[PDB]
Design a protein around this ligand. Structure first.
Ligand SMILES: [Zn+2]
Ligand SMILES: [Zn+2]
Length: 86
């Protein structure tokens, strides 16, 4: 037997006059400011709280997080900051 099925105009069609779709809505997790960052980094800073927080897990950034991901980072917290992080 066999399977498979793929086909869309999103292959050889370039975007045109498309300014409706939203880029990246990055905001705090408490104040929920609301500002676009669409940046290639994980060191976002709120224009109000001025607190560095990840743009993915939306958690208090950490030097250890740098280079790693929300997943790997967490594992480091449970290991380093014991089973119960303060
Ligand atoms: Zn904020
Ligand atoms: Zn993260």
């Amino acid at each position: 037997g066999s399977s498979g099925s793929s086909g869309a105009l999103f292959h050889k069609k370039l975007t045109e006059g498309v300014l409706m779709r939203d880029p990246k809505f990055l905001w705090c997790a408490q104040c929920s400011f609301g500002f676009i960052y669409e940046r290639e980094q994980l060191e976002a800073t709120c224009p109000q709280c001025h607190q560095t927080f990840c743009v993915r897990c939306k958690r208090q950034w950490e030097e250890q997080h740098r280079g790693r991901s929300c997943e790997d980072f967490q594992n480091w917290k449970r290991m380093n900051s014991g089973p119960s992080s303060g």
